[PDB]
Amino acid sequence: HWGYGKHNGPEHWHKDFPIAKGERQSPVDIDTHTAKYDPSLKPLSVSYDQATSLRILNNGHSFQVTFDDSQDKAVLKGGPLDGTYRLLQFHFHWGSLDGQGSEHTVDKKKYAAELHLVHWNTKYGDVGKAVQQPDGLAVLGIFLKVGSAKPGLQKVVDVLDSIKTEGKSADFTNFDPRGLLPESLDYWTYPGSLTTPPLAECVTWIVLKEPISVSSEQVLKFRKLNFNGEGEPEELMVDNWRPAQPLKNRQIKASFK
Template sequence: MCNKGRRQSPINVEPDKLLFDPYLRPLHIDKHKVSGTLHNTGQSLVFRVDKDTKQHVNISGGPLAYRYQFEEIYIHYGTENSQGSEHHIQGYSFPGEIQLYGFNKELYHNMSEAQHKSQGIVGISLMVQIGDTPNPELRIITSTFNKVLYRVVRIETIDARLRANT
């Protein structure tokens, strides 16, 4: 669908066009700590889980029919409070956006194999607002931002329990 101009990124979510699903289950993300590396791509920061991680973080539930193994986090942010997110909601750009990506571990062996296949990859976007209450799990990553200006930084553990206010 992407090569036909559908399901493209970035998108503008229009709330008045969304359909309510009363049977939608809660999204579940395992609560394991993982190690990885934080890269500066020049456009965003990317955290990649180490290949030799023993306990994987799985994403399931919600609209997902399969279990997906978490592999990467893309972090988009700007210098202005209202600019930074890749996606928009009703034309509004958020100060930041966290995108979690995983591959379908029930059908495929890794992200490379799954990326061009049906039901292969899941992407979850969390829009970031600036608030008064700090998030300790998010702080693990953001505290290293000043160290990735021009190089890769190793993060020993990241807690997969990034909390979102609902």
């Protein structure tokens, strides 16, 4: 029922999910002058060498690549995190135009898209239990700007024709998510939430400072996806981003001076 349109978009979500007006909702604007360097943060550890991708799918609000999280293969540790977080899936949020699409903003600047690599804290045993914990998930957020192509994204782009409509999926094995990362792991971090219903307040956000560049042709292919299912009226999957939410009683910490 929820979506991104006028009658079911983010301004309506609170009716079914009252935590939408909660104390640690995401995304937020990152005010770079107020975020404070935290020398206590340890270096991020992104260990994706053994990642095992499974499928790519259109779920009606984004497209997502899933991973086998049956074992400690692709894991995120360090930075603000205590313990080990397993990669479950990645997906994107994007705009109808290059000047919008990201969920987080930087000094109110919106990027053309935002990649979310979703990880869960293995101390809770399974992701369903983790989403009920304030420290259950860690999402690594990476901004996309339009410029040069990202070679590591092309395998994704070239299969989107096969999952145009909600409910479609395809095999997507042997995809290496390391090809989606920027050079620098400098980041901002803050406690927040899922940015789609149920908006659970279970996420440590780690947002990389350095965007990746993708080409206009790559992002154009994102915008040809459909929110609707096959055999329904075509509604292009664009502007599937939640806007910045109030920061409230939170501090955004920087890993870098």
